[PDB]
């Protein structure tokens, strides 16, 4: 047992054991003779869950009594991952449970692997929401996460013949012990219908009704006895729905399809009706809940003092016109008063600048689905443009650029413009991203209301991303500076005075080696794949995207391979290149990239001459639980997106906190990370945002690079001739064609500097001691990237509430 | 507290209370400050449930050790009703829980009303299966009820404008505390595909796979510590199902629709594909489970010694060819050996003789859905007819009459013929019904294999239908003969020596009066309807059907009304005529009858001259929980189906056990009931089966009755002229037209004798003392109609197992 995992008291271990047996008997209705590991996992989950309820009930009762300002974090995604270990960590029950299960003759780590990931997210945006919930609870904020309870989360990725195959993520199959259905708080949500204009107000009538049933999941703060709530809505059809008879009953599924599945798109907008329904569904149900809670604390002037609504991107942007609809149509407030309340209540966070990810809904869709909201949006736009016109008289083009309504083929509503107009604060997720917002995408808006624009650099929770996934590292750190850093990551700074400490250097390196052995083993157990634990673990895990440039990584791998075949008996630092991530089902290029990766592996991994010097592995079904395993085992973190495309990135922070060195571009949060650790302790390369713009003004011509770089030329010719696809020589024609003629992300432009930088990485790896010393400098300066810091800034600069680290009663 | 409700021990009441509070806290995650009656109901349900698990686990472990012959009761319907009180009754926890909740300041009766009925049945057939499970557990048989877990059971009936409106029975909305999902025992079921004939055997390939997930519900025996299992299958789509992406995920519902809803038809066959899928689904999953359990006890010669499969009607008839498919195709047994095993394992129970209820599936449907089963059925038919041909040489018409395959417009498979051929026993559900089977419908089959035909008169469980719904009556009975009768109903005979006992007569009458007041009150509480508790409670509750002749009851009500208007100041015994029951959604005539009933009420209930002398009420949403309320409060039980149409009837037995006198035809079980109590203690009237046949040979002409009975003529003219439907004068034209020209059930033919008999009933009611004495004679002789007797006969004469009343350890 390690210190950071809590005490294994005599009384508590005994109590845990009896409750474990009670649940196995009464809850699972099983005896030890027929119980399977899954049954044991559930018995443990219910045992741990019991310890939450007491705190959950008093935390909520506490907020009722003290009535603080409530924070409502609206998101269509909450990438939670597993809950068992995280709960034990935050409740200081890990060692006790480890001991108790040990005495029952069970391996707790084996049981934890049985829990299904709650994959209600796609990647960064969803995971961010998860880290935020953890931090808000840890900082004692009366926060509520509101989203959708998807029956099917992000699809499970299978690799067949080197191709990605998707299969339903039936995560609720065996039941979810963490959620508590609250059917008693079911709310009605309206769709379609029409607008009637009577004497005293407009009415939305003849609507189709869908019920929203809430499910509450506890969110425990770190050892402070605070347990907040994440409320996920589930779609239910009313009972007089469609009410020949048989068909009417079967058609109930049409209404319940709203919460059936998560759209698997990462940084891409797909204007489908079902998605719009999901967005309004979560918004409509949540707002009624918010107002209900408010009225139970009618002058809505105090609404903004008791309520803060944070929009995670534009997905829940309809909250703005829905809040207006309710205040104006239902509560009968005058427009101006209602608008004042709305702006002061809502804040919007932008997560990207790539045009294809921007939500622009066709007016005809809103027209049919939400007629009243479309009217309110036109009215908002009207009054907004009147302000623009008055601020910039005669600037007609600005008016059309800022309009919430975009003209053209089909009129569309720019949801981002809607969010800026109806929010008192708009923020980017990293300094460079936030600056880009003010200088480009939202320049006109920043000019009109500069006070609205802020920055809130992303962060990650040190509980799940350090203590939970890397106990060995958390331990050796605690041994030298205590445990306070876990909820005050800035204290890792103190590790700077151990950079020359021989014992520490040795332990840091030892922990990494153990993590690598542990992962190298897992690889063979669950995926029959052998790798050399002594090689440098070069990993790039994140969603497959052209802007992420997994292709640039591929070019390097092929370069390494060609160099080896060129001079076989020459020494080179051994490397295990691991690339993992899911591709959106309809993203063809992303799926071709996955195939290319596996294709490269097929050649490289079986070339006798290469031996154990180079291995290319594609990490299947990358998800939160897998991240917790690979990240602690990585040496090199690949954060190589084209400058200006990765709003922030969070995977980069996870790697930095876990002892991996970073090779990347000055993009997103990488800039601040390098700034914190010092550029000398970072492997920075490639074009800066300015270099990219210069190239765009000049005109990007990939051919130029192809003509001037022999090694690059050789790679393209190998791809084109079928060297990596014998049976299908032209298999990768689309890839080569894109690289050569329409590469929006300038892969070739950063090739030379990338490769060169990679050589510097290999050189440092040859010097174990100095590599580890640089690692210590990174870990020691990663404190700024804790989501506790991020949330503290949101609370103080946007929500107007003070974080607290005071422990609530037991 | 009453004696039959068990002891309210000091230790147990204390234990119950703490566990109630534990569940409210840890299970429902609520505090007393926010708990609603529903939360309290669930806390109690979980508390009671806890007492079942221990016994449930050892009962099943017991069967594993002793390995007795297992009884598998296959049914597409299990009309369970509520489970809370029944569980308390069988566990002798009722008084303790009553006390415990009392001390917690809660009214247990109020909490029981919150439980949703498990309405997984239509009427008699489904309820019979429920009573049987209760009796099999009480008799210590290793029995398993196997069926489908419908998401939506029988629809909830709403009456709007006097018309029936159906609405989804979302009984799982708030969760079901009684079931235990067993996802670990999920089994695959195949559909469609084709048959491949290879060298060594035929193969069923290219099939669509649907998963069957089982949910187990405990079935406690009466105070014997036995807890059997009812396993209900739920349809689940495999995860690589349909696996653009979004659509594939949404289409999973196509496969899961199989267990979505119960077909609401009572005694009517609807040849829909979805229904056929449900039938094979339950059969395929169940048989794999049966064989699995058998192999874990490969000579299948002992299969019939360890397994008995009872087919509740033909709904699960595919078990016969499915068992053959498995034994022949999968286990590779020779046909003859397989057939021997199948016949010795299966037994079939017929529940009706009406042609429209007989299952005849179109060959083209089986051809597409279950190609292999169709081949097996042809093969069975072939060999079967060869036996017929050899037994009755040259009788070509017999061959075509007995064929499992019916020729004509579209070829169909007669499932009843299939069941007779593949079963070692076939039984009717009442003596007269069983005789009718041998003399008519299955005459040819009886001639070929007379040994197969048996009778097993239906019964009802005295636990739910006496002790649970009528504690007051169970108590006064127990006070004079003890409690042993509850599991040995024949002992009620002893009450015969109290027929002249003044105290007993007074108590029996008192209990009835209290039940009537209790019901008259409930009527006003939940349905704002006032009635006179001193009137005779004339009730007919059962599914709406023409053969049940609710119309004959209507004619009498109208007769009573017309007589009163004719002589207003003449005295007549006051009556409250209550009619209730659901009509199948697509059964037009049944829906018109409901409207007629409410229409009669509209006129009769508001006629000043009638006063409180006559009231016509339609009992809305008749279901098991409502039956438990009305039956104990009834004085007169209407069992007036045309002789030969009601196979048995079970509602009739419920009324007899609860102190109501019966007016009915010599049909179904009424014959045996009258035989048991003595015809002098029964109000028998109308045509006997023989009279009906005579009339059919002559030719039924309704006009004749219309011309010779003035009162009848007046009623038809009132209906035709719009007397009961002013705004819509011809509203009931279909009813009159049917009555006059195509009445398959000869309503007019029994009118005169019915009315006359009703006069005899009123006469006896005027003499309280003698009415009650006749009641005592009925209750005292109702013992034969206990399902314990029925099940004991099934066990000894069909399954070959001995019932046991021995209590298993605590
Ligand atoms: C739209 C969207 O999901 N954007 C992203 C992401 N996950 O892709 O949000 C996360 C969280 O802010 C950022 O770190 C990524 O750089 C940004 O692209
Ligand atoms: C088919 C069918 O459900 N038949 C019925 C019924 N419920 O309608 O079965 C029950 C139980 O045996 C019998 O009492 C009824 O007389 C018979 O009609
Ligand atoms: C952290 C995380 C991400 C975000 O990774 P980036 O490299 O910032 O894109 C995505 N997926 C999972 C499973 C994560 O844990
Ligand atoms: C007993 C019962 C029946 C069967 O009634 P019959 O009069 O035999 O048709 C039908 N429905 C319910 C709810 C029952 O309790």
mmCIF file of C-alpha atoms in Angstrom, chain A residues 516-623:
data_model
loop_
_atom_site.group_PDB
_atom_site.id
_atom_site.type_symbol
_atom_site.label_atom_id
_atom_site.label_comp_id
_atom_site.label_asym_id
_atom_site.label_seq_id
_atom_site.Cartn_x
_atom_site.Cartn_y
_atom_site.Cartn_z
ATOM 1 C CA UNK A 516 6.298 1.028 -19.520
ATOM 2 C CA UNK A 517 6.689 -2.611 -18.440
ATOM 3 C CA UNK A 518 3.133 -2.573 -17.113
ATOM 4 C CA UNK A 519 1.850 -1.241 -20.436
ATOM 5 C CA UNK A 520 4.075 -3.451 -22.578
ATOM 6 C CA UNK A 521 2.534 -6.346 -20.666
ATOM 7 C CA UNK A 522 -1.061 -5.144 -21.032
ATOM 8 C CA UNK A 523 -0.385 -4.869 -24.755
ATOM 9 C CA UNK A 524 0.370 -8.594 -24.975
ATOM 10 C CA UNK A 525 -2.459 -9.663 -22.660
ATOM 11 C CA UNK A 526 -5.391 -7.914 -24.332
ATOM 12 C CA UNK A 527 -3.985 -7.540 -27.864
ATOM 13 C CA UNK A 528 -1.278 -10.170 -28.446
ATOM 14 C CA UNK A 529 1.437 -7.655 -29.352
ATOM 15 C CA UNK A 530 5.091 -7.783 -28.295
ATOM 16 C CA UNK A 531 7.164 -4.620 -27.899
ATOM 17 C CA UNK A 532 10.581 -3.684 -26.507
ATOM 18 C CA UNK A 533 10.166 -1.963 -23.086
ATOM 19 C CA UNK A 534 13.631 -0.451 -23.506
ATOM 20 C CA UNK A 535 12.703 1.522 -26.604
ATOM 21 C CA UNK A 536 11.574 5.140 -26.523
ATOM 22 C CA UNK A 537 7.764 5.219 -26.298
ATOM 23 C CA UNK A 538 6.736 7.691 -29.013
ATOM 24 C CA UNK A 539 2.997 8.219 -28.772
ATOM 25 C CA UNK A 540 0.301 10.247 -30.480
ATOM 26 C CA UNK A 541 -3.157 9.533 -29.083
ATOM 27 C CA UNK A 542 -6.108 11.774 -29.925
ATOM 28 C CA UNK A 543 -8.956 11.772 -32.443
ATOM 29 C CA UNK A 544 -7.865 11.187 -36.048
ATOM 30 C CA UNK A 545 -7.970 14.530 -37.874
ATOM 31 C CA UNK A 546 -6.060 16.077 -40.747
ATOM 32 C CA UNK A 547 -5.302 19.143 -38.645
ATOM 33 C CA UNK A 548 -3.777 16.928 -35.919
ATOM 34 C CA UNK A 549 -1.416 15.718 -38.634
ATOM 35 C CA UNK A 550 -1.051 12.055 -37.727
ATOM 36 C CA UNK A 551 0.196 12.030 -41.340
ATOM 37 C CA UNK A 552 3.240 14.126 -40.433
ATOM 38 C CA UNK A 553 3.999 11.510 -37.773
ATOM 39 C CA UNK A 554 3.627 8.798 -40.433
ATOM 40 C CA UNK A 555 6.110 10.564 -42.709
ATOM 41 C CA UNK A 556 8.654 10.547 -39.896
ATOM 42 C CA UNK A 557 8.109 6.851 -39.164
ATOM 43 C CA UNK A 558 8.651 6.032 -42.832
ATOM 44 C CA UNK A 559 11.744 8.246 -42.831
ATOM 45 C CA UNK A 560 13.197 6.320 -39.875
ATOM 46 C CA UNK A 561 12.436 3.071 -41.660
ATOM 47 C CA UNK A 562 14.073 4.141 -44.927
ATOM 48 C CA UNK A 563 17.182 5.367 -43.089
ATOM 49 C CA UNK A 564 17.538 2.013 -41.351
ATOM 50 C CA UNK A 565 17.204 0.063 -44.604
ATOM 51 C CA UNK A 566 19.773 2.443 -46.089
ATOM 52 C CA UNK A 567 22.319 1.805 -43.320
ATOM 53 C CA UNK A 568 21.187 -1.358 -41.441
ATOM 54 C CA UNK A 569 24.270 -1.760 -39.271
ATOM 55 C CA UNK A 570 24.187 1.816 -38.045
ATOM 56 C CA UNK A 571 22.966 2.403 -34.494
ATOM 57 C CA UNK A 572 19.714 4.242 -33.860
ATOM 58 C CA UNK A 573 17.763 4.811 -30.666
ATOM 59 C CA UNK A 574 15.054 2.117 -30.513
ATOM 60 C CA UNK A 575 11.495 3.433 -30.686
ATOM 61 C CA UNK A 576 7.999 2.104 -30.326
ATOM 62 C CA UNK A 577 5.764 4.482 -32.212
ATOM 63 C CA UNK A 578 2.235 4.293 -30.917
ATOM 64 C CA UNK A 579 -0.616 6.064 -32.638
ATOM 65 C CA UNK A 580 -4.212 5.734 -31.543
ATOM 66 C CA UNK A 581 -7.533 7.463 -31.977
ATOM 67 C CA UNK A 582 -10.977 7.093 -33.489
ATOM 68 C CA UNK A 583 -12.087 8.534 -36.799
ATOM 69 C CA UNK A 584 -15.611 9.874 -37.277
ATOM 70 C CA UNK A 585 -17.561 7.219 -39.259
ATOM 71 C CA UNK A 586 -18.169 9.511 -42.234
ATOM 72 C CA UNK A 587 -14.695 11.078 -42.317
ATOM 73 C CA UNK A 588 -13.129 9.209 -45.226
ATOM 74 C CA UNK A 589 -9.647 10.759 -45.080
ATOM 75 C CA UNK A 590 -9.416 10.021 -41.345
ATOM 76 C CA UNK A 591 -10.239 6.388 -42.066
ATOM 77 C CA UNK A 592 -7.604 6.257 -44.790
ATOM 78 C CA UNK A 593 -5.023 7.581 -42.340
ATOM 79 C CA UNK A 594 -5.794 4.766 -39.900
ATOM 80 C CA UNK A 595 -5.292 2.260 -42.725
ATOM 81 C CA UNK A 596 -1.993 3.911 -43.657
ATOM 82 C CA UNK A 597 -0.790 3.589 -40.074
ATOM 83 C CA UNK A 598 -1.596 -0.107 -39.885
ATOM 84 C CA UNK A 599 -0.134 -0.562 -43.391
ATOM 85 C CA UNK A 600 3.166 0.990 -42.299
ATOM 86 C CA UNK A 601 3.126 -1.318 -39.293
ATOM 87 C CA UNK A 602 2.641 -4.346 -41.547
ATOM 88 C CA UNK A 603 5.858 -3.524 -43.399
ATOM 89 C CA UNK A 604 8.011 -2.142 -40.579
ATOM 90 C CA UNK A 605 7.060 -4.672 -37.898
ATOM 91 C CA UNK A 606 7.992 -7.644 -40.092
ATOM 92 C CA UNK A 607 11.201 -6.456 -41.729
ATOM 93 C CA UNK A 608 14.017 -8.678 -40.349
ATOM 94 C CA UNK A 609 16.615 -5.964 -40.892
ATOM 95 C CA UNK A 610 14.752 -3.549 -38.610
ATOM 96 C CA UNK A 611 14.493 -5.997 -35.733
ATOM 97 C CA UNK A 612 13.385 -4.515 -32.416
ATOM 98 C CA UNK A 613 14.739 -1.108 -33.413
ATOM 99 C CA UNK A 614 11.441 0.231 -34.773
ATOM 100 C CA UNK A 615 7.843 -0.793 -34.104
ATOM 101 C CA UNK A 616 4.657 0.884 -35.310
ATOM 102 C CA UNK A 617 1.559 0.055 -33.294
ATOM 103 C CA UNK A 618 -1.948 1.435 -33.700
ATOM 104 C CA UNK A 619 -3.651 1.644 -30.310
ATOM 105 C CA UNK A 620 -7.133 0.246 -30.854
ATOM 106 C CA UNK A 621 -10.250 1.825 -29.339
ATOM 107 C CA UNK A 622 -8.506 4.791 -27.711
ATOM 108 C CA UNK A 623 -10.718 6.071 -24.902
#
